[PDB]
């Protein structure tokens, strides 16, 4: 059934599972035409497929060419997502194939279900959680590889860098979702916090800075404060 606050620890057990987020698959800028009409121009997108236990990210880049001469693109994007996720599963050895796939948006259930008909023992699940994975393109290295792509491409990352050497998956996922929640609610501030100190660097093979354990606590606190403030401003509380 649907994933929620109650069965939250199931994400970190030893049954392989993947989150799929399609928010950034079909991305457009909206502009005015010479005659005054409105038109869209697509930019490159990505499917965000993530193993929450291990941090393995399967970043499938969606090149604008996939849209060429197609209608009802926002609808097509869900089926393309499902096609690509199904192809990823088929590409993995049997023992790496997931037992569950959790889609962050309920509109993905039918397209993924139909594309996975060959895998009847993989459960396709929705979630009630409000996960911040749309902010993935606020991570500079992910945004950069998507925008630079000139063709379809799968790029692999560990979204937790090396954190798991020192913390558990539960805590690693909590750190990730806090960082992404902050980037989502006020990107400019969130990014200021992460770089304000020029002496803490991002390793070439990492996505996030090399904070010590103590510096991560200061960081996490700064990110919480950021999120709370935005909220009273949003609602006036």
């Amino acid at each position: 059934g649907a994933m929620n606050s109650s069965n939250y620890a199931e994400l970190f057990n030893n049954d392989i599972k993947l989150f799929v987020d399609d928010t950034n698959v079909y991305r457009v800028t909206v502009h005015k035409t010479f005659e005054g009409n409105v038109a869209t121009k697509a930019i490159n997108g990505c499917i965000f497929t993530l193993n929450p236990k291990t941090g393995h990210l399967f970043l499938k880049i969606i090149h604008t060419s996939v849209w060429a001469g197609q209608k009802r693109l926002s609808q097509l994007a869900k089926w393309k997502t499902a096609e690509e996720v199904s192809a990823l599963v088929r590409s993995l050895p049997k023992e790496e194939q997931p037992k569950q796939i959790i889609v962050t948006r309920k509109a993905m259930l039918d397209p993924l279900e139909v594309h996975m008909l060959d895998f009847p023992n993989i459960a396709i699940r929705p979630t009630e959680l409000r996960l911040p994975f749309s902010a993935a393109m606020s991570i500079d290295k992910l945004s950069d590889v998507v925008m630079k792509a000139t063709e379809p491409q799968m790029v692999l990352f560990n979204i937790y860098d090396d954190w798991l050497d020192r913390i558990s998956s539960y805590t690693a996922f909590s750190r990730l979702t806090l960082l992404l929640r902050a980037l989502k609610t006020n990107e400019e501030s969130a990014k200021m916090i992460l770089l304000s100190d020029p002496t803490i660097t991002i390793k070439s093979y990492h996505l996030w800075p090399s904070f010590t354990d103590e510096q991560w606590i200061t960081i996490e606190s700064q990110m919480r404060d950021l999120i709370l403030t935005e909220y009273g401003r949003k609602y006036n509380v």
């Binding site: 096609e83 397209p111 139909v114 008909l117």
Partner: protein, 300 residues
């Protein structure tokens, strides 16, 4: 014109024949139904005055033999049986008519209702959905489950309707996932019409039989089958023109004949709102759409 005699009526029961029905009191001298129109299937059905549960009945065609009803005090229900002795059977029927102990099938001559509800229904197809091949007639009741319902328990007692499932390999060609899920034309025309049913008449026959079972016995799995077969047509972009016109007429008489007080359970809001207003064939059910609005606008 044919006759189904009743040996007796030992328990108070409401008896139906097609869309007609009569109340019969315990040990009232009821001895059967005469003037039944030759040329169509028929169904005689029962609901005991004490157990307003388990409506049950028998599908039959009088051209396939002489049938009668007899109450069984061990199994507790009116059973249909076949009389093989042709002489013995006209003797029973003629004596019962002479004493005038039979109701006449009460068909107004202007009325094509039963024809319109049973146009494509054929006894031989019923007997494949209800497998009991030593009888020429078919028993159905409120509680019987379908082969599809079972898969998600006694198979001898199942309704073997054709399984339709929009999220199946059967329904979805590999490589046309999105195309086939959004436009079920290949599932309707190649898999179902050409492949399984062979022609549209057999398809319509199963659809009509499922409706009638839902209407007369409140058989819920039949209701699921009737809706599924409608939805498969309405969700296909490419349907032969003769099917769409005939579908509009079929559904019209089905909606026309439903008891007004039953539209809540027998009618599936999602299916009908999608068929009449969102589907490829939204504009091809003019008569069905018009009677639905004027009779059950709440559902919509």
């Amino acid at each position: 014109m044919n006759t189904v005699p009743f040996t007796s009526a030992p328990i108070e029961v409401t008896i139906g024949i097609d869309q007609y029905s009569f109340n019969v009191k315990e040990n009232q001298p009821f001895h059967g139904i005469k003037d039944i129109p030759i040329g169509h299937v028929h169904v005689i059905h029962f609901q005991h005055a004490d157990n307003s549960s388990m409506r049950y009945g028998y599908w039959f065609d009088c051209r396939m033999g002489n049938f009668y009803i007899q109450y069984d005090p061990k199994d507790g229900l009116y059973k249909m049986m076949e009389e093989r002795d042709g002489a013995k059977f006209e003797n029973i029927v003629h004596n019962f008519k002479e004493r005038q102990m039979m109701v006449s099938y009460p068909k107004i001559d202007e009325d094509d209702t039963w024809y319109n509800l049973t146009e494509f229904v054929q006894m031989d197809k019923i007997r494949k959905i209800v497998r009991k091949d030593e009888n020429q007639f078919s028993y159905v009741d409120s509680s019987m489950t379908t082969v599809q319902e079972n898969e998600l328990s006694d198979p001898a007692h199942s309704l073997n309707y054709t399984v339709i499932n929009f999220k199946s390999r059967e329904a979805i060609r590999p490589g046309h996932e999105m195309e086939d899920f959004l436009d079920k034309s290949y599932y309707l025309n190649t898999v179902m019409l050409q492949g399984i049913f062979k022609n549209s008449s057999n398809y319509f026959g199963e659809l009509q039989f499922a409706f009638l079972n839902a209407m007369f016995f409140g058989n819920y799995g039949s209701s699921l089958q009737w809706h599924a077969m409608i939805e498969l047509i309405c969700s296909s972009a490419t349907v032969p023109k003769h099917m769409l016109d005939k579908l509009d007429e079929i559904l019209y008489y089905q909606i026309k004949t439903l008891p007004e007080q039953y539209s809540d359970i027998l009618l599936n809001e999602r299916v009908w709102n999608i068929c009449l207003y969102s589907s490829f064939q939204k504009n091809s059910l003019h008569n069905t759409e018009k009677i639905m609005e004027n009779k059950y606008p709440e559902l919509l």
